[PDB]
Coordinates of C-alpha atoms and ligand atoms in Angstrom, one line a residue:
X1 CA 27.5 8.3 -12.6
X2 CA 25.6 4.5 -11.8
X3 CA 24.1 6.5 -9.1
X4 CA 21.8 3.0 -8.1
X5 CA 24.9 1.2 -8.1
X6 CA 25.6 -2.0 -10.4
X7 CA 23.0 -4.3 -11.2
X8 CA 22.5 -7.4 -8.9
X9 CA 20.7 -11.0 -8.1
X10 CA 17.3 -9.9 -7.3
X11 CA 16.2 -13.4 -5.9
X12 CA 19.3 -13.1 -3.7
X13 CA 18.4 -9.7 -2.5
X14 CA 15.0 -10.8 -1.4
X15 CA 16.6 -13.7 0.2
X16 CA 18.6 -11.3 2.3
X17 CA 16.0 -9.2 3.6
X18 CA 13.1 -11.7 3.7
X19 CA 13.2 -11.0 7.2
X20 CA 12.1 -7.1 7.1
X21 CA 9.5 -8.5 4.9
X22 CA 7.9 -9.9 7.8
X23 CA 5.7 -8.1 10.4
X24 CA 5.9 -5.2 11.6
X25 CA 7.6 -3.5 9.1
X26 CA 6.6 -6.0 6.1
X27 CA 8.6 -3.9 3.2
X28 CA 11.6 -3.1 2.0
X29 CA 12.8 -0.4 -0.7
X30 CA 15.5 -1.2 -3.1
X31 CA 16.7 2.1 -3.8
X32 CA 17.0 5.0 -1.9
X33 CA 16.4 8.8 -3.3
X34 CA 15.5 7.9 -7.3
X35 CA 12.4 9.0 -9.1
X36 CA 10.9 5.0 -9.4
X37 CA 10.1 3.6 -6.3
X38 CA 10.7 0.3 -6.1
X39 CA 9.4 -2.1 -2.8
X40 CA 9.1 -5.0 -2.3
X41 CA 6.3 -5.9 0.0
X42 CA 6.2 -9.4 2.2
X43 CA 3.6 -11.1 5.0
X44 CA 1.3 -11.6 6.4
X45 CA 0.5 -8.1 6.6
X46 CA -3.5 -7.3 6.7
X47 CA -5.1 -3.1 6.4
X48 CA -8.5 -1.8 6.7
X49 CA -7.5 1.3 5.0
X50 CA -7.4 2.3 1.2
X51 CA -4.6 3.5 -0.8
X52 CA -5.3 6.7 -2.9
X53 CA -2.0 7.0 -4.9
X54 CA -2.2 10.0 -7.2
X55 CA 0.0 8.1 -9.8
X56 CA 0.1 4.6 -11.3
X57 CA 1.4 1.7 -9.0
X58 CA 3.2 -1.8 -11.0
X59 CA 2.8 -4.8 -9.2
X60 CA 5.0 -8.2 -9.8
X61 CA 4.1 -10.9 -7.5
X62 CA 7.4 -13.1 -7.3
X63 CA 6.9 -15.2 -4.5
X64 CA 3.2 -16.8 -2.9
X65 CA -0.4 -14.9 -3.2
X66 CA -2.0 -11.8 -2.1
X67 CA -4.7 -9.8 -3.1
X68 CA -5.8 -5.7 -3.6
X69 CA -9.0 -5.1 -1.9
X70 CA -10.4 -2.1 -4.4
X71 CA -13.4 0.4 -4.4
X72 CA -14.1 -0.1 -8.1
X73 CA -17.8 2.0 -9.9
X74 CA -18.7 2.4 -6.2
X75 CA -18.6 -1.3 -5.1
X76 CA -15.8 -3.1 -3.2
X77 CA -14.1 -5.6 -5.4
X78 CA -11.1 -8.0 -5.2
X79 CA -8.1 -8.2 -7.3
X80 CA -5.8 -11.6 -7.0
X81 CA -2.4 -11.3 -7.2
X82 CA -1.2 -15.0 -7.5
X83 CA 2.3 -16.0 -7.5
X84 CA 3.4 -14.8 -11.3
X85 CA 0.7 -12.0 -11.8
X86 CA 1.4 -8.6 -12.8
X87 CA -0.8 -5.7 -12.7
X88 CA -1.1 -1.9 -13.3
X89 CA -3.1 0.5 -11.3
X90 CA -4.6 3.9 -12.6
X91 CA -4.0 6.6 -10.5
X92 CA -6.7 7.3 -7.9
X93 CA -8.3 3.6 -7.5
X94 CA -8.3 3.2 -4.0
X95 CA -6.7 -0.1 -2.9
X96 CA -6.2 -2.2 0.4
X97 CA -3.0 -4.2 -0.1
X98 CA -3.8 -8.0 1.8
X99 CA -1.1 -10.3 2.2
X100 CA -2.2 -13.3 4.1
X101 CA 0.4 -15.8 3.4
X102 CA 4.2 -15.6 5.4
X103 CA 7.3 -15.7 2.9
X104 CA 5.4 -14.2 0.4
X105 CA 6.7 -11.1 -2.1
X106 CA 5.4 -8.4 -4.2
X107 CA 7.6 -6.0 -6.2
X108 CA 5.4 -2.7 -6.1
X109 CA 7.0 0.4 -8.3
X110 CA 5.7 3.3 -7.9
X111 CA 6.7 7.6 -9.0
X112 CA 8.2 9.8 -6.6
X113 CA 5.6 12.6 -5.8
X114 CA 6.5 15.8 -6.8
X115 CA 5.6 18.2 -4.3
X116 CA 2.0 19.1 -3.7
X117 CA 0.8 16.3 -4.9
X118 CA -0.5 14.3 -1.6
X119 CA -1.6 10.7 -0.9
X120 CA -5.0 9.7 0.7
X121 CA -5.9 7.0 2.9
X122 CA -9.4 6.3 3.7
X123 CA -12.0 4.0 5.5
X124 CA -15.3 3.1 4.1
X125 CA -18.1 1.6 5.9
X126 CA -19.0 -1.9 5.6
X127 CA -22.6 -1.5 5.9
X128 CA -23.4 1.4 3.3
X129 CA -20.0 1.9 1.3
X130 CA -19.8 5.3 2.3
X131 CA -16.7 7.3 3.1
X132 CA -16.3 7.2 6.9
X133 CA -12.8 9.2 7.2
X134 CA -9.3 11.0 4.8
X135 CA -6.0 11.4 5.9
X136 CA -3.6 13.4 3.4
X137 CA 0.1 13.3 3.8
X138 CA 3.2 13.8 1.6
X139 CA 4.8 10.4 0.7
X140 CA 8.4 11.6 1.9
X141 CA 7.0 11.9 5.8
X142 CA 5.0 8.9 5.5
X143 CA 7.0 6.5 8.1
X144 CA 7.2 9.5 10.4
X145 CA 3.5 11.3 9.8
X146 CA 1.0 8.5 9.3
X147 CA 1.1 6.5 12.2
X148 CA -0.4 8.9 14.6
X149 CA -3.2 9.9 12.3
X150 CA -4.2 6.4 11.6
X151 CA -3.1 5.4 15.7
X152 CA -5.9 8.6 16.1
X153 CA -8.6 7.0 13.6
X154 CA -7.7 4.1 15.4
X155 CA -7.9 5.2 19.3
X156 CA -11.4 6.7 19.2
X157 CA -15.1 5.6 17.4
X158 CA -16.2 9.2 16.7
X159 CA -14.2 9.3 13.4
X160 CA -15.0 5.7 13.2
X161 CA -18.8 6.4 13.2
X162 CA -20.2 6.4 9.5
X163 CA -21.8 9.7 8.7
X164 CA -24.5 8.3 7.0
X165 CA -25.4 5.2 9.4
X166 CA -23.9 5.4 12.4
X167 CA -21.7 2.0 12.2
X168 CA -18.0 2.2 14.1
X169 CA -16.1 1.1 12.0
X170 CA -13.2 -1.5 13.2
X171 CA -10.1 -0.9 14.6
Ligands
LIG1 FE1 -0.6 1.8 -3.0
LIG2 FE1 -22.4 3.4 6.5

Protein backbone atom coordinates (compact mmCIF):
# COMPACT_ATOMS: atom_id res chain seq x y z
CA UNK A 1 0.00 0.00 0.00
CA UNK A 2 3.26 2.70 -0.84
CA UNK A 3 0.64 4.20 -2.99
CA UNK A 4 3.45 7.23 -4.01
CA UNK A 5 5.80 4.70 -4.71
CA UNK A 6 9.40 4.36 -2.93
CA UNK A 7 11.26 7.17 -1.98
CA UNK A 8 13.83 8.73 -4.50
CA UNK A 9 16.87 11.31 -5.35
CA UNK A 10 15.01 14.46 -5.42
CA UNK A 11 17.95 16.45 -7.02
CA UNK A 12 17.94 13.76 -9.68
CA UNK A 13 14.31 14.11 -10.22
CA UNK A 14 14.63 17.77 -10.83
CA UNK A 15 17.45 17.05 -13.08
CA UNK A 16 15.25 14.94 -15.17
CA UNK A 17 12.50 17.22 -15.78
CA UNK A 18 14.31 20.56 -15.65
CA UNK A 19 13.21 20.80 -18.97
CA UNK A 20 9.23 21.03 -18.29
CA UNK A 21 10.41 23.56 -15.81
CA UNK A 22 10.99 25.82 -18.55
CA UNK A 23 8.48 27.96 -20.51
CA UNK A 24 5.54 27.32 -21.34
CA UNK A 25 4.58 24.90 -19.01
CA UNK A 26 7.25 25.96 -16.24
CA UNK A 27 5.96 23.15 -13.47
CA UNK A 28 5.99 19.95 -12.75
CA UNK A 29 3.99 17.74 -9.96
CA UNK A 30 5.56 14.98 -8.24
CA UNK A 31 2.70 13.04 -7.39
CA UNK A 32 -0.28 12.36 -8.94
CA UNK A 33 -3.90 11.94 -7.04
CA UNK A 34 -2.61 12.41 -3.13
CA UNK A 35 -3.98 14.90 -0.63
CA UNK A 36 -0.39 17.19 -0.52
CA UNK A 37 0.38 18.68 -3.59
CA UNK A 38 3.66 18.85 -4.30
CA UNK A 39 5.22 21.13 -7.55
CA UNK A 40 8.00 22.08 -8.35
CA UNK A 41 7.97 25.36 -10.14
CA UNK A 42 11.01 26.56 -12.66
CA UNK A 43 11.78 29.79 -15.12
CA UNK A 44 11.59 32.35 -16.16
CA UNK A 45 8.02 32.41 -15.78
CA UNK A 46 6.45 36.08 -15.16
CA UNK A 47 2.13 36.75 -14.08
CA UNK A 48 0.23 39.77 -13.64
CA UNK A 49 -2.44 37.92 -11.78
CA UNK A 50 -2.80 37.00 -8.03
CA UNK A 51 -3.13 33.80 -6.41
CA UNK A 52 -6.05 33.48 -3.83
CA UNK A 53 -5.47 29.88 -2.49
CA UNK A 54 -8.07 29.10 0.13
CA UNK A 55 -5.36 26.99 2.13
CA UNK A 56 -1.75 27.45 3.15
CA UNK A 57 0.96 27.10 0.32
CA UNK A 58 4.93 25.85 1.60
CA UNK A 59 7.61 27.09 -0.43
CA UNK A 60 11.35 25.60 -0.60
CA UNK A 61 13.47 27.43 -2.94
CA UNK A 62 16.18 24.75 -4.01
CA UNK A 63 17.73 26.10 -6.91
CA UNK A 64 18.34 30.20 -8.02
CA UNK A 65 15.91 33.24 -6.80
CA UNK A 66 12.44 34.29 -7.30
CA UNK A 67 10.13 36.37 -5.64
CA UNK A 68 5.99 36.43 -4.50
CA UNK A 69 4.55 39.68 -5.48
CA UNK A 70 1.71 40.01 -2.51
CA UNK A 71 -1.31 42.31 -1.66
CA UNK A 72 -0.34 42.63 2.02
CA UNK A 73 -2.88 45.44 4.64
CA UNK A 74 -3.94 46.78 1.28
CA UNK A 75 -0.53 47.60 -0.27
CA UNK A 76 1.51 45.66 -2.83
CA UNK A 77 4.57 44.13 -1.29
CA UNK A 78 7.40 41.86 -2.25
CA UNK A 79 8.52 38.68 -0.76
CA UNK A 80 12.18 37.14 -1.80
CA UNK A 81 12.53 33.85 -2.20
CA UNK A 82 16.49 33.44 -2.54
CA UNK A 83 18.08 30.22 -3.22
CA UNK A 84 17.68 28.32 0.41
CA UNK A 85 14.50 30.29 1.68
CA UNK A 86 11.46 28.69 2.88
CA UNK A 87 8.30 30.30 3.53
CA UNK A 88 4.59 29.66 4.59
CA UNK A 89 1.61 31.42 3.30
CA UNK A 90 -1.79 31.94 5.22
CA UNK A 91 -4.65 31.05 3.33
CA UNK A 92 -6.21 33.93 1.39
CA UNK A 93 -3.00 36.28 0.83
CA UNK A 94 -3.06 36.93 -2.60
CA UNK A 95 0.28 36.19 -4.39
CA UNK A 96 1.97 36.71 -7.92
CA UNK A 97 4.51 33.92 -8.20
CA UNK A 98 7.81 35.80 -10.36
CA UNK A 99 10.49 33.72 -11.51
CA UNK A 100 12.96 35.77 -13.48
CA UNK A 101 15.99 33.63 -13.53
CA UNK A 102 16.21 30.26 -16.18
CA UNK A 103 17.20 26.85 -14.30
CA UNK A 104 15.84 28.01 -11.29
CA UNK A 105 13.41 25.79 -8.74
CA UNK A 106 10.80 26.09 -6.20
CA UNK A 107 9.24 23.21 -4.29
CA UNK A 108 5.55 24.61 -3.65
CA UNK A 109 3.13 22.12 -1.49
CA UNK A 110 0.06 22.76 -1.31
CA UNK A 111 -3.78 20.75 0.07
CA UNK A 112 -5.96 19.15 -2.32
CA UNK A 113 -9.29 21.27 -2.31
CA UNK A 114 -12.02 19.49 -1.09
CA UNK A 115 -14.95 20.30 -3.16
CA UNK A 116 -16.62 23.62 -2.99
CA UNK A 117 -13.97 25.23 -1.92
CA UNK A 118 -12.67 27.34 -5.09
CA UNK A 119 -9.57 29.29 -6.01
CA UNK A 120 -9.39 33.03 -7.08
CA UNK A 121 -7.32 34.83 -9.40
CA UNK A 122 -7.36 38.43 -9.60
CA UNK A 123 -5.99 41.77 -11.16
CA UNK A 124 -5.50 44.87 -9.30
CA UNK A 125 -4.86 48.24 -10.76
CA UNK A 126 -1.56 49.80 -10.70
CA UNK A 127 -2.72 53.21 -10.28
CA UNK A 128 -5.26 52.94 -7.35
CA UNK A 129 -4.84 49.26 -5.86
CA UNK A 130 -8.28 48.54 -6.49
CA UNK A 131 -9.66 45.26 -7.62
CA UNK A 132 -10.13 45.43 -11.48
CA UNK A 133 -11.41 41.63 -12.12
CA UNK A 134 -12.11 37.57 -10.16
CA UNK A 135 -12.04 34.40 -11.83
CA UNK A 136 -13.16 31.34 -9.56
CA UNK A 137 -12.41 27.82 -10.60
CA UNK A 138 -12.00 24.43 -8.93
CA UNK A 139 -8.25 23.43 -8.77
CA UNK A 140 -8.87 19.84 -10.40
CA UNK A 141 -10.06 21.71 -13.93
CA UNK A 142 -7.49 24.27 -13.64
CA UNK A 143 -5.11 23.21 -16.81
CA UNK A 144 -8.34 22.76 -18.71
CA UNK A 145 -10.71 25.87 -17.34
CA UNK A 146 -8.40 28.80 -16.73
CA UNK A 147 -6.80 29.55 -19.75
CA UNK A 148 -9.86 30.90 -21.62
CA UNK A 149 -10.99 32.96 -18.70
CA UNK A 150 -7.70 34.64 -18.24
CA UNK A 151 -7.14 34.42 -22.59
CA UNK A 152 -10.81 36.49 -22.08
CA UNK A 153 -9.39 39.08 -19.39
CA UNK A 154 -6.62 39.02 -21.66
CA UNK A 155 -8.30 39.56 -25.25
CA UNK A 156 -10.49 42.65 -24.39
CA UNK A 157 -9.84 46.15 -22.11
CA UNK A 158 -13.46 46.39 -20.82
CA UNK A 159 -12.64 43.91 -17.96
CA UNK A 160 -9.33 45.44 -17.94
CA UNK A 161 -10.73 48.92 -17.20
CA UNK A 162 -10.38 49.72 -13.41
CA UNK A 163 -13.86 50.50 -11.91
CA UNK A 164 -12.71 53.09 -9.99
CA UNK A 165 -10.20 55.03 -12.56
CA UNK A 166 -10.61 53.97 -15.71
CA UNK A 167 -6.81 52.52 -16.23
CA UNK A 168 -6.59 49.23 -18.71
CA UNK A 169 -4.89 47.26 -17.18
CA UNK A 170 -1.91 45.25 -19.13
CA UNK A 171 -2.12 42.32 -21.03
FE1 LIG B 1 -0.43 29.89 -5.16
FE1 LIG C 1 -7.46 52.09 -10.41
Amino acid sequence: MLTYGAPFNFPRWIDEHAHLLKPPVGNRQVWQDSDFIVTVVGGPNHRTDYHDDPLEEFFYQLRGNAYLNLWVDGRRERADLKEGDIFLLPPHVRHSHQRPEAGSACLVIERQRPAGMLDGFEWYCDACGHLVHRVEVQLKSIVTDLPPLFESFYASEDKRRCPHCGQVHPG
